[PDB]
Amino acid sequence: LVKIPGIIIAASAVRAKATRISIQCRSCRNTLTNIAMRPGLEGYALPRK
Amino acid sequence: LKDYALEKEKVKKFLQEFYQDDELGKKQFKYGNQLVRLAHREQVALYVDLDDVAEDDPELVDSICENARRYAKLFADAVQELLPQYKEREVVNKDVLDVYIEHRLMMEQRSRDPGMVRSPQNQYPAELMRRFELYFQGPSSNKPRVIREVRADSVGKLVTVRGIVTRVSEVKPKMVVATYTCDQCGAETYQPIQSPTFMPLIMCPSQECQTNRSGGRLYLQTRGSRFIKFQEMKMQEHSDQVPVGNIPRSITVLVEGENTRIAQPGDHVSVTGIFLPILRTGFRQVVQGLLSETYLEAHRIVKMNKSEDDESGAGELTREELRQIAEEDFYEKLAASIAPEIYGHEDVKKALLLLLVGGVDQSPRGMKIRGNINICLMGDPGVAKSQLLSYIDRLAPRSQYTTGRGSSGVGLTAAVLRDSVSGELTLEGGALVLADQGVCCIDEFDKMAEADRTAIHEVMEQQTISIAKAGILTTLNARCSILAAANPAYGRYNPRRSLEQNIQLPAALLSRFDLLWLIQDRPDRDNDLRLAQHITYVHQHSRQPPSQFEPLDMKLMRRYIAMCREKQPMVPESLADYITAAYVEMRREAWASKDATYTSARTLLAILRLSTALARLRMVDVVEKEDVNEAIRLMEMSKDSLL
Amino acid sequence: AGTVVLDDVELREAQRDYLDFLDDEEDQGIYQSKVRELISDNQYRLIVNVNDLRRKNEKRANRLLNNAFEELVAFQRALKDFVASIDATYAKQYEEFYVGLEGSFGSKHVSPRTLTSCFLSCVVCVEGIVTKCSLVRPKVVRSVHYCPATKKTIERRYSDLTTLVAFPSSSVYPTKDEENNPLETEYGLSVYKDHQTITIQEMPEKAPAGQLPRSVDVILDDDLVDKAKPGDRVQVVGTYRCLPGKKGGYTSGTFRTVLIACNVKQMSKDAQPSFSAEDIAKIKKFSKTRSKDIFDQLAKSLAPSIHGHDYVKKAILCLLLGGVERDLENGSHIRGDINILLIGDPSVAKSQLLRYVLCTAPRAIPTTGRGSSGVGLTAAVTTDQETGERRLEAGAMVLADRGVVCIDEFDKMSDMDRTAIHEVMEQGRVTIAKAGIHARLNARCSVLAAANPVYGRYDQYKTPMENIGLQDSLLSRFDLLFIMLDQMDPEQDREISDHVLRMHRYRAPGEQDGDAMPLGSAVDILATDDPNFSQIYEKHDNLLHGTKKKKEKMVSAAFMKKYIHVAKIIKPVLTQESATYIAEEYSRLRSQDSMSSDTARTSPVTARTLETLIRLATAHAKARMSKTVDLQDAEEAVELVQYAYFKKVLE
DNA sequence: AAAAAAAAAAAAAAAAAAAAAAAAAAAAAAAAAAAAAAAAAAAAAAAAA
Ligand SMILES: Nc1ncnc2c1ncn2[C@@H]1O[C@H](COP(=O)(O)OP(=O)(O)OP(=O)(O)O)[C@@H](O)[C@H]1O
Ligand SMILES: Nc1ncnc2c1ncn2[C@@H]1O[C@H](COP(=O)(O)OP(=O)(O)OP(=O)(O)O)[C@@H](O)[C@H]1O
Ligand SMILES: [Mg+2]
Ligand SMILES: [Mg+2]
Ligand SMILES: [Zn+2]
Ligand SMILES: [Zn+2]
């Protein structure tokens, strides 16, 4: 946990990042709901099975 | 829902026994004759008028207009089946594609085995061996649609739209069937092309190369393949059919085959065709779904309403037009018919008619003198200069109208712009190129940019445009006559200053104009009352007050002018001295006076081309002395207002 | 897996509630009438005010505003049932009947800046300006195929999975038969709906000053597509949703969000007014009862806060009413628009008249001398930069088609700009061309301009030509020119100062209670509805602090708006007595000897002056709702032109 | 008549190969977009009698 000062020179448009996702299987249509997403600039690899 | 074998029999029946009395009242089979003509390869395009189909099967016309691509295919099938029984001799093989068709047909006969059933792929594609092409002419019971309102509910339907052509690509070959040969077998492979792109084949599928299980790589070649003349245009909504706060909408028209080379940019056209989609797959599409672009697959392209075509080849007309052209007051009647809602300006309208007709271009021992008449209406405020210019724009076949600086710079000249069929840099012309052999009406000529005035110099005399800028290095080709409108130096003629100090044109530009007309409106009770009565009648009834001669319709004026245009008259030697004396006298009085414009040899050339135009209006083949007299009189009336 | 819902209790309750709300026949049948009316004029979208739904069923209203697709599909099922009950043939003629929403959204009224992720899958109202429209593309919803080998015809449906998971089997376009026989598509038998994406930006005058703008992507589906063009201030109601990404294997967790429009509307100032039968009766009563002095009653009631300038106000009423455009058979055109120029001393309320017409007139566009420069005033030609093609851009005077451009500080406008507007001010069109594109845009507008004379103040001792710094070509197409002069007469000062001080003491009833200050700050606007797209009207204003008391009333602003809208449509025809009078009047005006010495011409008299006599007489006749241009109309026109065209030079 | 036999002959358990079925299964490359900056042409406003 750091505390730094500074001046803000750009502010992106507010966008939508998922905190929980649900995925559905293409054949049996069963769902794998409420998968928790890591906060920050971190992605998610879907289950391969 | 419906059975297409029965529909094919229906269209065969229509093609075989529809008749009309078109041939001078003689009853002809309208489409059987054409089946004969295109069985002997003397015709390519068959325009199936749907009004003819509707005479005896309106349900068929409904089906056609609702699917319109199934039925184009059906009609092509039916005519292709009818052609052998309409062939009364052996085609002379006028073409190179014909040799390929003949060799393929002969080989197919040679290895026939009539009872043996060959694979569905072991045949020639229909499109490979047609040589004709079939188009619909929309039923007149279909009211034309507006480009904006041709939407997804009319995909696949035959629609008719009209608008200005803004942009036409060049004619280039579109692959219809890609032909391949193999390096092992000796069979040809055909790949009919429907998409805008295709992956060329690699391995051949022929029977021999499958039996042998050989490599059999196949090679794409242009020589046996089928191309079609292809051309893509952009067409735009007409101004009086755009919503209020809007800009006009475009539509892509894909023109192929015999409909190419009809529309040029600037043309008013009516296009009949099928509104069709292009799958538009490939992008990083934001939205899931099968989104696609649209285009009008042109079937019939008809220039109209200022660029009417067929009347030109139909110069033969009624005995009436013979009798009016023979009349002596024909020139006065044509002049009076120019903008009848504008009152007065009789001599101005005579000069404008001369600009429309034009003189004869000379090409003596490589030193070109242009027969174009350029006119400038240098007038007071509110003397109907813009109305005359707008009328002449609506009248002349290839006319562009330009006001102060909306069409400045490359809006007059050309520019290099990216295309789409080839993705390279094409050259697009502006107003001076869109009016290459017509009139360019320059309103507010005096408030024009100096670069554009310089370009107008070089256009007016050399009839080209030389551009040597970065992206562009060309000599465009601008054979137009300039109709300019301007105000005197301070917006109104000032009698306290000199004539050229009011004109505010340099001698070079002032000499570029064969006729420069001063239009002053001094008030006077009688003439002002007459002008007011004319104007108030026009407001009251939306027409000019009736006079002794009904003004000609703008179609008749175009036909009369166009019929005059191909009437090159020659100045005889017997007039040489008369013309020279008139020029010398004019030249002498130019510097005798202290209130005269620049005069030069161009003044002689103006006399000469004005008199040639006047001779042309009388349909004579030599210029007489009355033409030179009328030219002289118009040249004085141009400055008569000064008195 | 393919299942069906045998029983969805929620769907049943929702559909029953929505059909119950729609039946409406017991409750003065407003939606009963609305549905019969959309059946009548051959539409298939029903615009539903959520205030009515909130009245009839508040639980549905909350559920619908908060769970937009579930509730909207329930409500569209209910709507199709209602239409089928009213008319089964029309109902079967359309596959889907859509419901658009309207009214007051409490916190669901946002801008592209305040539209955040707490609104996903909710119905929201977003206001902004269109920055880019896409092309209108057809999207295939039902593809029909024919196999020539087997003569079979098949059809394949594509559900709208725009904001739902799409599995790749959902989007396969059939090319082959099961026997691998080539299929060919029946384009005229297939069904396509058209699709368009726009981007809505926060309005520049609503955004925080100095920050970059925020936008939202908006999807428009069939019958909503061409409803907006770039530069329009629109209100879009729809569902806010997160778009599916492409089938990956790794996701960053980021979703593109989008608004799926269920209704698009323009500024309600430019929309066709609603006319209750009582309103038409009142208009007919007004016109018939007071016919001689109806024009003056309307004129002096124009800008009540401005004292005096009665001739200017008559002319501005004529501008608001307009002449009648002539459309000759050969395509020739004569304008019916009146152009007015006000030149005057500083602070004589001419910027106020311009502003009044901006508030009142439909399709009025503001501009200042150097705020618009050519291309920004008339059209423009740019290149699409992503397709390489020329694109036309409408400037101020194209956007003011069938409207007014209110040009202020017209004198400080550069000379090239005034040259540019010459062609619009007479022909009502903008001719524009670069090499790849040429167009002739319609700009049928009337110009109301305010200028100051040379030297800032008018010089009573100089000719109006020497004092208006404009040339006869520019002046002559201003068909009325008013020198609004600051004379420091003391009784005139009595009158004006009294009126002005009286306007600076008036409090609006109820809203003001004694010391209130009006302002709200950047949140209070979104707190309540916008009075720009928002949906009993008297005739005369009641007496108040605006006027002291007298035997002459004041036409209500709302009634005047309705009356002027009705009267503007009229096309009075010039009679022969009017035509003779106008012709002789013009002939007399042209001859200077009729007009005194020491009296100069403000603007020249040309054939345009005759055309404007006709236009003003026609506008007067419109005010009386005459259908004929009578001699009183011609006399009023001539007296207005006589007042405007001459000024007394002093010494 | 019953008393040893001496087979069927049924079961449980084994083998014992087949032949079919079942189970495992991310990272590397590309492209597009959106943003920048740069050469050129083009369009403005200060100069003066
Ligand atoms: N002789 C005339 N006959 C009929 N109408 C006229 C005549 N003179 C002027 N008008 C009318 O006056 C109006 C103004 O005409 P127009 O705009 O052509 O003037 P202009 O010559 O272009 O003036 P400027 O030099 O200011 O451009 C038009 O609507 C036209 O109908
Ligand atoms: N006759 C009048 N009646 C009512 N208010 C007036 C009158 N004359 C001036 N005013 C007041 O003067 C103030 C300034 O008016 P405005 O800004 O319209 O002047 P202007 O004529 O545009 O000045 P300029 O020509 O310098 O732009 C306004 O608030 C207006 O209320
Ligand atoms: Mg003009
Ligand atoms: Mg002001
Ligand atoms: Zn599964
Ligand atoms: Zn081979």
**Residue C266 CB contacts under 8 Å (≥ 6 apart), including other chains:** C227, C228, C232, C233, C234, C533
What are the backbone dihedrals phi and psi of residue C593, each rounded to the nearest 5 degrees, phi first?
Answer: -65, -20
Resolution at which this structure was determined, Å: 2.6
Is B47:B79 a contact under the CB 8 Å cutoff?
no
Is B359:B617 a contact under the CB 8 Å cutoff?
no
**What 3-state class would DSSP assign to C407?**
strand
**What 3-state class would DSSP assign to C257?**
strand
What span, in angstroms and rounded, lies between the C-alpha atoms of C396 and C366?
8
In whole angstroms, D26 C1' to C241 CA is: 31
What span, in angstroms and rounded, lies between the C-alpha atoms of C408 and B534?
36
What span, in angstroms and rounded, lies between the C-alpha atoms of B106 and C239?
66
The H-assigned helical ranges of C41-101 are 50-56, 58-66, 68-86, 88-93
**Residue B479 CB contacts under 8 Å (≥ 6 apart), including other chains:** B370, B372, B436, B437, B463
Task: List subunits contacting chain B, requiring 3 or more Cβ pairs under 8 Å.
Answer: C
- Residue B468 CB in 7 A reach of strand D: no
Domain B319-635's class?
A: alpha beta
The 8-class DSSP code of residue C101 comes to E
Burial (CB count <10 Å: 0-12, 13-18, 19+), residue C216: buried
Beta carbons of C161 and B539 less than 8 Å apart: no
Residue type, B149: E
For the annotated binding site of C for ATP, the residues are 522
DSSP strand pairing (B481-486 vs B439-442): parallel
Beta carbons of C253 and A24 less than 8 Å apart: no
What span, in angstroms and rounded, lies between the C-alpha atoms of C47 and C51?
12
CA C8 to chain centre: 44
CA A40 to chain centre: 8
- Protein-contacted bases of chain D (C-beta within 7 A): 25-28, 32-33, 40-45
Closest chain A CA to residue C3: A29
The DSSP secondary structure of B423-445, one letter per residue, reads -SEEEEE-HHHHTTTSEEEESSG
What span, in angstroms and rounded, lies between the C-alpha atoms of B523 and C588?
10
Counting ligands in written order, the one closest to the CA of A25 is 5
What span, in angstroms and rounded, lies between the C-alpha atoms of B449 and B454?
9
Identify the experimental approach: cryo-EM
What span, in angstroms and rounded, lies between the C-alpha atoms of C509 and B557?
69
What span, in angstroms and rounded, lies between the C-alpha atoms of C321 and C343?
22
What stretch of H or E contains C9?
helix C9-23
- Residue C374 CB in 7 A reach of strand D: yes
| Chain A closest-CA separation from residue C172 CA (Å) | 14
Is C433:B452 a contact under the CB 8 Å cutoff?
no
Strands, E assignment, B129-217: 133-137, 158-168, 172-182, 188-192
Residue C151 backbone class (left: φ over 0; alpha: ψ -120 to 50; beta: rest): left
Is C330:C308 a contact under the CB 8 Å cutoff?
no
What span, in angstroms and rounded, lies between the C-alpha atoms of C453 and C346?
9
What span, in angstroms and rounded, lies between the C-alpha atoms of B439 and C526?
57
Burial (CB count <10 Å: 0-12, 13-18, 19+), residue B125: middle
What stretch of H or E contains B512?
helix B507-512
Burial (CB count <10 Å: 0-12, 13-18, 19+), residue C383: middle
Is B271:B296 a contact under the CB 8 Å cutoff?
yes
CA C138 to chain centre: 28
What stretch of H or E contains C441?
strand C438-442
What span, in angstroms and rounded, lies between the C-alpha atoms of B274 and B66?
10
In whole angstroms, D33 C1' to C241 CA is: 22
* B409 labeled part of a ligand binding site: no
Is B385:B375 a contact under the CB 8 Å cutoff?
no
What stretch of H or E contains C264?
strand C257-265
Is C345:C458 a contact under the CB 8 Å cutoff?
yes
- Residue C427 CA neighbour count, 13 Å, CB half: 25
What span, in angstroms and rounded, lies between the C-alpha atoms of B391 and B106?
61
First to last CA, chain B: 82
Beta carbons of C438 and B266 less than 8 Å apart: yes
Residue of C367, C362, C424, C365 whose CA lies nearest to C400: C365
Instruction: Report residue B490 as tokens.
Output: 């301070």
Chain B residues whose beta carbon lies within 8 Å of the beta carbon of residue C591: 523-525, 528
**Smallest Cβ distance to C257: which of A16, A21, A26?**
A16
Strands, E assignment, B237-310: 250-256, 268-278, 293-303
Burial (CB count <10 Å: 0-12, 13-18, 19+), residue B24: exposed
Alpha carbon separation from B641 to B380, B495, C440, C632 (Å, rounded): 11, 11, 33, 38
What span, in angstroms and rounded, lies between the C-alpha atoms of C114 and B621?
80
What are the backbone dihedrals phi and psi of residue B10, each rounded to the nearest 5 degrees, phi first?
Answer: -65, -45
Chains A and B touch (3+ CB pairs under 8 A): no
> Sign of dihedral through CA atoms C99, C103, C104, C109?
positive
DSSP strand pairing (A44-45 vs B19-23): unpaired
Instruction: Report residue B534 as tokens.
Output: 């004319």
The 8-class DSSP code of residue B249 comes to P
What span, in angstroms and rounded, lies between the C-alpha atoms of C302 and C560?
9
The 8-class DSSP code of residue A38 comes to P
Instruction: Report residue C27 as tokens.
Output: 């409750």
Is B505:B487 a contact under the CB 8 Å cutoff?
no
What span, in angstroms and rounded, lies between the C-alpha atoms of C419 and C473?
10
B144-151: Cβ within 8 A, 24+ apart: B144/B270, B146/B237, B146/B241, B147/B235, B147/B236, B147/B237, B147/B248, B147/B249, B147/B250, B147/B251, B148/B237, B148/B242, B148/B243, B148/B249, B148/C226, B150/B251, B150/B275, B150/B296, B151/C136, B151/C138, B151/C194, B151/C225
> Sign of dihedral through CA atoms C166, C170, C175, C178?
positive
Residue of B354, B392, B305 whose CA lies nearest to B564: B354
**What 3-state class would DSSP assign to C403?**
strand
Is C573:C628 a contact under the CB 8 Å cutoff?
yes
- Which residues, in sequence order, are bridge partners of residue C416? none
What stretch of H or E contains B42?
none
In whole angstroms, D40 C1' to B416 CA is: 14
Instruction: Report residue C322 as tokens.
Output: 């307009």
**Residue B100 CB contacts under 8 Å (≥ 6 apart), including other chains:** B224
**What 3-state class would DSSP assign to B130?**
coil
Is B432:B410 a contact under the CB 8 Å cutoff?
no
The DSSP secondary structure of C541-610, one letter per residue, reads PPP-TT----S---B-HHHHHHHHHHHHH--PEEPHHHHHHHHHHHHHHH-GGGS-TTEEESS---HHHH
Residue type, C51: N
Residue of B1, B8, B11, B139 whose CA lies nearest to B65: B139
Alpha carbon separation from C296 to C207, C289, C555 (Å, rounded): 42, 14, 11
What span, in angstroms and rounded, lies between the C-alpha atoms of B440 and B438?
7
In whole angstroms, D37 C1' to B237 CA is: 38
Is C418:C474 a contact under the CB 8 Å cutoff?
yes
Counting ligands in written order, the one closest to the CA of B180 is 6
Ligand 1 atom index nearest CA of C426: 17
Unique residue bearing structure tokens 């009023």: C636
Q: Which residues of B491-519 are buried (b: 16+ CB within 10 A; e: fewer)?
A: bbbeeeeebbebbebeeebbbbbbbbbbb
- Tell me the angle at which helices C310-321 and C557-569 cross, rounded to the nearest 10 degrees: 50
Burial (CB count <10 Å: 0-12, 13-18, 19+), residue C87: middle
Is B177:B193 a contact under the CB 8 Å cutoff?
yes
Is C183:C176 a contact under the CB 8 Å cutoff?
yes
Whether residue C394 lies within 8 A of chain B, CB to CB, comes out as yes
What are the backbone dihedrals phi and psi of residue C12, each rounded to the nearest 5 degrees, phi first?
Answer: -60, -50
What is the CA angle C428-C433-C434, rounded to 5? 160
What stretch of H or E contains B405?
none
Strands, E assignment, C5-71: 45-49
Is C618:C572 a contact under the CB 8 Å cutoff?
yes
Instruction: Report residue C647 as tokens.
Output: 């000024």
| Chain C closest-CA separation from residue B325 CA (Å) | 22
Instruction: Report residue C472 as tokens.
Output: 């006869």
What span, in angstroms and rounded, lies between the C-alpha atoms of B573 and B419?
53
Instruction: Report residue B479 as tokens.
Output: 């054979």
Residue of B293, B301, B248 whose CA lies nearest to B275: B293
What span, in angstroms and rounded, lies between the C-alpha atoms of C612 and C221?
46
Burial (CB count <10 Å: 0-12, 13-18, 19+), residue C461: exposed
The 8-class DSSP code of residue B98 comes to H
DSSP strand pairing (A16-17 vs C254-255): antiparallel
- Which residues, in sequence order, are bridge partners of residue B438? none
Number of H helices, E strands in chain A: 0, 4
CA C474 to chain centre: 29
Residue C171 backbone class (left: φ over 0; alpha: ψ -120 to 50; beta: rest): alpha
Closest chain B CA to residue C613: B536
Burial (CB count <10 Å: 0-12, 13-18, 19+), residue B327: exposed
Is C624:C633 a contact under the CB 8 Å cutoff?
yes
Determine which residue's CA is closest to atom 4 belonging to ligand 2: C306
Chain C residues whose beta carbon lies within 8 Å of the beta carbon of residue A15: 254-255, 257
What span, in angstroms and rounded, lies between the C-alpha atoms of C251 and A16?
13
- Residue C373 CB in 7 A reach of strand D: yes
Residue type, C30: I
What stretch of H or E contains C482?
strand C480-484
HEC secondary structure over C130-177: EEEECCCEEEEEEEEEECCCCCCEEEEECCCCCCCCCCHHHHCCCCEC
Instruction: Report residue C110 as tokens.
Output: 């946002």
If you compute the radius of gyration of chain B from its CA atoms, what whole number of angstroms results? 30
Beta carbons of C434 and B430 less than 8 Å apart: yes
Interruption sites in chain A after residues (C→N beyond 2.5 Å): none
Residue of B346, C212, B55, B305 whose CA lies nearest to A13: C212
Residue of B520, B67, A15, B543 whose CA lies nearest to C255: A15
**What 3-state class would DSSP assign to C118?**
helix
What span, in angstroms and rounded, lies between the C-alpha atoms of C39 and B422?
49
**Residue C597 CB contacts under 8 Å (≥ 6 apart), including other chains:** none
Whether residue C390 lies within 8 A of chain B, CB to CB, comes out as yes
Beta carbons of B533 and C422 less than 8 Å apart: no
Q: Residues near ligand 1 with C-beta < 6 Å?
A: B 342-344, 379, 381-387, 487, 531, 535; C 334, 426, 473, 607-608, 611
